[PDB]
């Protein structure tokens, strides 16, 4: 059947060009050794079964682990489940109209002493993982609600560009076949620098799918059904709770 013929030519496709040498190529093949066929197929289809395609998003995939490691190398489970739980980030049971899952993040009262930027990045790359099981998903990607009416002057202060950084090579590189677009709501008129600070490491493609709508969410709607959406994030389901997706995860 052609799925396992293209799950082996990636994984001889990755043994070939680790035998060159080259640093990546050799992370790369280590790196995905304990992996199943299933995980190799997200790529293969992701990319319409072709395989060099695939190679190329899993080498992004790999570098982002060798950059991050702090996120992955004592990963709890445990640990990313009392993240889940308190709310970050968040995840609806509905796709929007796109047939993308959608993210969420409500910046009010979070306090990174608390919860760490890291932690909530662990979150993130925890819950894709499981959700790219899915093959509708490994298609259609997902998308991010920010909710920023309750980003303080003192956030903003204290928000380190190496975390944001971060933030914008989980998704470019990390997860770009995936990642579809991010919607901001009621930011602040200070949001303008954080944004600032990022663009200039955010390539044309990623800079595309960055949507800011303020307090006007006519446009925001027309993207994301009010009726799918947590009452804090201006729709008419209850207050968005984070247990419930943690016990479907886990
Ligand atoms: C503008 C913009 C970004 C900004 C993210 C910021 C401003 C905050 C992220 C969330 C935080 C604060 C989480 C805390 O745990 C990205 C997504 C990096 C890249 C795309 C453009």
Same mark, same amino acid.
């Given at each position: 059947?052609?799925?396992?013929?293209?799950?082996?030519?990636?994984?001889?496709?990755?043994?070939?060009?680790?035998?060159?040498?080259?640093?990546?190529?050799?992370?790369?093949?280590?790196?995905?050794?304990?992996?199943?066929?299933?995980?190799?197929?997200?790529?293969?289809?992701?990319?319409?079964?072709?395989?060099?395609?695939?190679?190329?998003?899993?080498?992004?995939?790999?570098?982002?682990?060798?950059?991050?490691?702090?996120?992955?190398?004592?990963?709890?489970?445990?640990?990313?489940?009392?993240?889940?739980?308190?709310?970050?980030?968040?995840?609806?049971?509905?796709?929007?109209?796109?047939? *993308? #899952?959608?993210?969420?993040?409500?910046?009010?009262?979070?306090?990174? &002493? $608390? !919860?760490?930027?890291?932690?909530?990045?662990?979150?993130?790359?925890?819950?894709?993982?499981?959700?790219?099981?899915?093959?509708?998903?490994?298609?259609?990607?997902?998308?991010?609600?920010?909710?920023?009416?309750?980003?303080?002057?003192?956030?903003?202060?204290?928000?380190?560009?190496?975390?944001?950084?971060?933030?914008?090579?989980?998704?470019?590189?990390?997860?770009?076949?995936?990642?579809?677009?991010?919607?901001?709501?009621?930011?602040?008129?200070?949001?303008?620098?954080?944004?600032?600070?990022?663009?200039?490491?955010?390539?044309?493609?990623?800079?595309? *799918? #960055?949507?800011?709508?303020?307090?006007?969410?006519?446009?925001?709607? &027309? $993207? !994301?059904?009010?009726?799918?959406?947590?009452?804090?994030?201006?729709?008419?389901?209850?207050?968005?709770?984070?247990?419930?997706?943690?016990?479907?995860?886990?």
């Amino acid at each position: 059947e052609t799925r396992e013929e293209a799950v082996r030519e990636l994984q001889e496709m990755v043994q070939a060009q680790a035998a060159s040498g080259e640093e990546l190529a050799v992370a790369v093949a280590e790196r995905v050794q304990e992996k199943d066929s299933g995980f190799f197929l997200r790529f293969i289809r992701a990319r319409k079964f072709n395989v060099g395609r695939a190679y190329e998003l899993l080498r992004g995939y790999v570098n982002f682990r060798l950059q991050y490691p702090e996120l992955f190398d004592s990963l709890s489970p445990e640990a990313v489940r009392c993240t889940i739980e308190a709310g970050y980030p968040g995840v609806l049971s509905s796709r929007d109209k796109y047939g *993308r #899952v959608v993210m969420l993040f409500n910046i009010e009262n979070w306090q990174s &002493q $608390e !919860i760490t930027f890291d932690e909530i990045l662990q979150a993130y790359c925890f819950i894709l993982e499981k959700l790219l099981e899915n093959e509708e998903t490994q298609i259609n990607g997902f998308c991010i609600i920010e909710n920023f009416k309750g980003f303080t002057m003192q956030q903003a202060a204290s928000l380190r560009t190496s975390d944001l950084r971060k933030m914008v090579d989980m998704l470019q590189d990390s997860f770009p076949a995936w990642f579809k677009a991010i919607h901001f709501i009621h930011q602040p008129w200070y949001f303008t620098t954080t944004y600032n600070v990022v663009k200039p490491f955010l390539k044309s493609k990623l800079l595309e *799918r #960055v949507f800011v709508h303020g307090d006007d969410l006519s446009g925001f709607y &027309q $993207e !994301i059904d009010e009726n799918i959406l947590p009452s804090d994030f201006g729709g008419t389901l209850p207050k968005y709770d984070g247990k419930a997706v943690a016990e479907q995860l886990f």
